[PDB]
């Protein structure tokens, strides 16, 4: 039980102690704190409201020195998200520059950045060019596909 195990276990404990609205995250198994499942529901008044998005978080062994691999298990239409589901955010950018990965960034904070990026899609990485270009070219069509993703995530 090294740094990763101690830290990871403490983080989950807090997630079950003080749970945020629309944020259900935790390890898949008690005998496996390296694979976490995150259910983030898009906040109201956004283009992704009511979107129960399922994401997988694969943590490293030198945690929290290194950032976790967050990947969506469902279809998405976000400029900062690769077509394969890999999330690209400066907060998870390991330095081997205002926003970078830091051991002080808990999973709770990591999720906050994702929720914030969902409300304000700020393309800094440029993963989903189809969306990144559309976001600026046609805000109307973007909202159409965005809300469509909500239907697909909720299963409607």
């Amino acid at each position: 039980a090294g740094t990763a195990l101690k830290r990871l276990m403490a983080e989950y404990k807090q997630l079950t102690l003080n749970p945020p609205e629309g944020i259900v995250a935790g390890p898949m198994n008690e005998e496996n704190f390296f694979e976490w499942e995150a259910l983030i529901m898009g906040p109201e008044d956004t283009c992704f409201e009511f979107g129960v998005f399922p994401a997988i978080l694969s943590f490293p062994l030198d945690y929290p020195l290194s950032p976790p691999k967050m990947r969506f298990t469902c279809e998405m239409f976000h400029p900062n998200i690769y077509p394969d589901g890999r999330v690209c955010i400066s907060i998870l950018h390991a330095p081997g520059s205002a926003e970078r990965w830091s051991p002080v960034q808990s999973v709770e904070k990591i999720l906050l950045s994702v929720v914030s990026m969902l409300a304000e899609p700020n393309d800094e990485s440029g993963a989903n060019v189809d969306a990144s270009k559309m976001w600026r070219d046609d805000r109307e069509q973007f909202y159409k596909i965005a809300k469509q993703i909500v239907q697909k995530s909720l299963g409607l």
């Binding site: 749970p19 259900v24 008690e30 409201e49 909500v150």
Partner: peptide
């Protein structure tokens, strides 16, 4: 303990989802 939390967690993910659905539609 081992699985007390496991079930608890599954419930939160389930509820939350069903809620979003109730919402999205009632909206």
């Amino acid at each position: 303990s081992a699985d007390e939390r496991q079930r608890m967690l599954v419930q939160r993910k389930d509820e939350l989802l069903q809620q979003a659905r109730k919402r999205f539609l009632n909206k």
